[PDB]
Curated annotation (Swiss-Prot):
This is Adapter molecule crk. GO terms for cellular component: cytoplasm; membrane; plasma membrane; protein-containing complex. It is found in: Cytoplasm; Cell membrane. The keyword Repeat applies. Residues 1-59, 102-163 form the SH3 domain. It comes from the Eukaryota. The modification Phosphotyrosine is found at residue 88.
Length: 163
């Protein structure tokens, strides 16, 4: 309900963010939006936080483990011939993952397939859908989340919304 647990690590960095790492318990103070929530550290520090990076602290179903013991390792590339280190002639910077990514916001996937959280964890979506990328490690192949269906995929086929 109120306080939440961050088991996705955030390790932010700013005055308007609440960096954490280690099932930290952060109390909610103000939630202007639904995707983001203003939390407070256990020390007395207030900073924003990506909601998806926490569970919500609310039991109901069995097996709380949302992924405990997954595959932090990224999937190998399918394309052969190194098409390009970035997107096609894009006068903009719609490059894969710039840094941390503005999100977890709302991305409009315009080019994917039909994978199974088994194949390579690769979430399942369709051109004209949208996923909320939350997990972001490297600046290339990271992970995301739509309807729980987490996985990986290049940002070279999405159109970030207006949040």
């Amino acid at each position: 309900v109120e306080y939440v647990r961050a088991l996705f690590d955030f390790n932010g960095n700013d005055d308007e963010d609440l960096p954490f790492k280690k099932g930290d318990i952060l109390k909610i103070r103000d939630k202007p939006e639904e995707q983001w929530w203003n939390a407070e550290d256990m020390d007395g520090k207030r900073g924003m936080i990506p909601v998806p990076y926490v569970e919500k602290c609310r039991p109901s179903s069995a097996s709380v483990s949302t992924l405990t013991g997954g595959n932090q390792d990224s999937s190998h590339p399918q394309p052969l011939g190194g098409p390009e280190p970035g997107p096609y002639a894009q006068p903009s910077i719609n490059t894969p993952l710039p840094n941390l990514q503005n999100g977890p916001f709302y991305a409009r996937v315009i080019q994917k397939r039909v994978p199974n959280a088994y194949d390579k964890t690769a979430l399942a979506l369709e051109v004209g859908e949208l996923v909320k990328v939350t997990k972001i490690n490297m600046s290339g192949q990271w992970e995301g989340e739509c309807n729980g269906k987490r996985g990986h995929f290049p940002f070279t086929h999405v159109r970030l919304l207006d949040q």
